[PDB]
């Protein structure tokens, strides 16, 4: 679990949207694993607008955060699971680093702000769905 909020937004993992999440839609795509709903209260997140490659994620099956190398955005295969059937995911980073369900949604971050989420994992790899093309997040 987890989300970024950045002004009237919630940015969150597709499969794991809510009730409220889906009454109040902004923008879904079942490729990226990404949907976006309008919240009351102001966020508060910096997202990053950059091509870095390094920075820090939070791992919520260590309780830890930890510094990795990752991928740039790219279409890559994800195996079929209870929530979609096997595909290309697209703006999908990956890194070497510890993973487990449960894991999606800890925010990756860089020097500049938040990156992305966590959203794929398995065989000592994690999967970040990328963020910092959705411009429209600000304004
Ligand atoms: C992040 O931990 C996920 C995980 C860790 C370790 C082993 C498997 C997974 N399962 C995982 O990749 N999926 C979870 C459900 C939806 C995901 C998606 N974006 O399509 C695919
Ligand atoms: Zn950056």
Request: net charge negative; charged share 20%.
């Amino acid at each position: 679990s987890g989300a970024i909020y950045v002004g009237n937004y919630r940015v969150v993992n597709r499969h794991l949207a809510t009730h409220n999440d889906w009454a109040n839609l902004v923008w879904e795509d079942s490729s990226r694993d990404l949907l976006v709903s309008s919240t009351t209260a102001q966020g508060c997140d910096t997202i990053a607008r950059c091509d870095c490659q390094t920075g820090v994620y939070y791992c919520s099956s260590r309780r830890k955060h930890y510094p990795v190398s990752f991928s740039k955005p790219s279409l890559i295969f994800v195996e079929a699971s209870e929530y979609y059937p096997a595909r290309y995911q697209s703006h999908l980073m990956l890194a070497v680093g510890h993973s487990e369900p449960g894991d999606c949604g800890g925010i990756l971050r860089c020097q500049h702000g938040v990156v992305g989420i966590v959203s794929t994992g398995g065989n000592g790899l994690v999967g970040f769905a990328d963020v910092r093309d959705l411009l429209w997040l600000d304004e």
